Design a protein around this ligand. Structure first.
Ligand code: NI
Length: 341
């Protein structure tokens, strides 16, 4: 059944709750972003109102074939009334179209639902600065102190420098980047930009990217693989067997592959820095795992929460085990005692 952490009290609303059939008493279904664990269950047969960003609405229409009459896109940073309740959508700094949602309950309670987010100090100057938030539904993906990772900017500088050096040393090297969802587009766009190439990809992935309102996108991507020296493949294909296979497909146009796997966290984060990362190499193929995250580090999460000073925190990630739930509750209490709320 629908878990309590997907329901907004005092309303008929649910958030990211499309796989339970009809939720008894739901009058509006919000969707924070287009990732499959969140939209799971939506299709052309859905007949309840879906509230979301413009970009998530484009993906629902074009990829899932949800009918236009059930898609309700809302502008960001704008007070809107939904079924009698004031809401605001905020940029979540996750993937394209991803939002946080502020609910203003008729009784005066204010609720923030972060969806999935990567906390940033810029959020401290949004419409959140303007009133008190009582209850926080929090993306706790990386809620433990071991989870450090570099800034997105640091990671993209590493990727750009690595690729430019490799291709300038060997003009017959191909760059491949893995993907299995929307998000982390800066990785392949930044590398293609420094190399004066468009990124080449499958017709399905091109269609997905043409839904994201990225400025000048027609100048940056293509379905013509041959004309491109940055290819995107399914993340599954980013291994030596998959890459040797791919290289055969290019008809001796290339003699070397340099591949990127943008992971979340991996345990080499605890020891090694970004300047010191090394690839796995077999033959003329080298694979770099780069820690490009679209979720909060522990410290970023902690700063946001200590700034916001909520009365109550409801985790939305890692909630399935008693050990995880207890660990999280211990950090929340530490944070509240340190900051004095
Ligand atoms: Ni997500």
């Amino acid at each position: 059944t629908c878990p309590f952490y997907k329901k907004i009290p005092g309303t008929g609303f649910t958030v990211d709750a499309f796989q339970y059939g009809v939720v008894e008493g739901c009058t509006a279904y919000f969707l924070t972003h287009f990732h499959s664990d969140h939209y799971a269950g939506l299709s052309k047969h859905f007949t309840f109102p879906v509230y979301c960003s413009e970009i998530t609405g484009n993906l629902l229409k074009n990829k899932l074939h949800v009918q236009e009459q059930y898609i309700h896109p809302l502008p960001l940073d704008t007070e809107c009334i939904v079924n009698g309740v004031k809401v605001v959508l905020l940029d979540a700094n996750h993937c394209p179209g991803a939002v946080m949602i502020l609910f203003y309950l008729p009784n005066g309670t204010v609720i923030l639902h972060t969806g999935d987010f990567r906390a940033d100090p810029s959020m401290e100057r949004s419409l959140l600065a303007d009133q008190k938030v009582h209850m926080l539904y929090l993306d706790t993906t990386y809620c433990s102190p071991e989870y450090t990772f570099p800034s997105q900017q640091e990671v993209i500088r590493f990727a750009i420098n690595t690729a430019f050096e490799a291709v300038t040393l060997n003009p017959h090297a191909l760059v491949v980047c893995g993907t299995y969802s929307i998000g982390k587009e800066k990785v392949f766009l930044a590398i293609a930009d420094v190399l004066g190439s468009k990124v080449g990809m499958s017709q399905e992935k091109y269609k997905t990217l043409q839904c994201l309102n990225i400025p000048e996108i027609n100048s940056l991507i293509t379905t013509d693989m041959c004309s491109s020296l940055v290819h995107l493949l399914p993340m599954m294909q980013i291994n030596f067997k998959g890459l040797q296979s791919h290289l055969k497909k290019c008809g001796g146009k290339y003699n070397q592959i340099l591949a990127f796997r943008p992971t979340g966290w991996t345990h080499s984060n605890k020891f090694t820095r970004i300047a010191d990362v090394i690839p796995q190499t077999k033959g003329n193929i080298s694979i770099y795992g780069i820690p490009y995250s679209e979720h909060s580090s522990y410290l970023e999460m902690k700063r946001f929460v200590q700034w916001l000073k909520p009365q109550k925190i409801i985790p939305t990630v890692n909630v399935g085990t008693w050990k995880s739930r207890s660990t999280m509750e211990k950090y929340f209490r530490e944070w509240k005692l340190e900051a004095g709320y």
